Design a binder for this molecule. Structure first.
Ligand SMILES: O=C1CC[C@H](N2C(=O)c3ccccc3C2=O)C(=O)N1
Ligand SMILES: [Zn+2]
Length: 97
């Protein structure tokens, strides 16, 4: 009901609408959902900063633990003075609804 599930297998809740937050700027200074918390995702490999969509963070591939659908990434801060230190960037089209 606030629940966002893996579109491919529909088994797993990956996150909730309660966890959604925005890193995009609202003044003169979409496709990827950013949430504080997620569940039922397996991380693949090790963090990388290459081509990072969120400067200051590294990314690790995150896939549904059941069906292995590539749902998004875990982003982890490269510096201690950043907040949050970690979040999830999820491909919207990989989630239901
Ligand atoms: O923050 C991110 C997450 C990883 C994402 N990524 C991809 O989706 C991708 C596909 C193929 C080759 C290389 C990449 C890449 O770095 C990307 O470009 N930036
Ligand atoms: Zn799945």
């Amino acid at each position: 009901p606030t629940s966002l599930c893996c579109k491919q297998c529909q088994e797993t809740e990956i996150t909730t609408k309660n966890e959604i937050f925005s890193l995009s700027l609202c003044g003169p200074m979409h496709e990827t959902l950013t949430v504080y918390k997620a569940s039922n995702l397996n991380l693949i490999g090790r963090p990388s900063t290459v081509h990072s969509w969120f400067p200051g963070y590294a990314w690790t591939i995150a896939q549904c633990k059941i069906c292995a659908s590539h749902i998004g990434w875990k982003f982890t801060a490269t510096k201690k003075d950043m907040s949050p230190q970690k979040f999830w960037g999820l491909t919207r089209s990989a989630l239901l609804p």
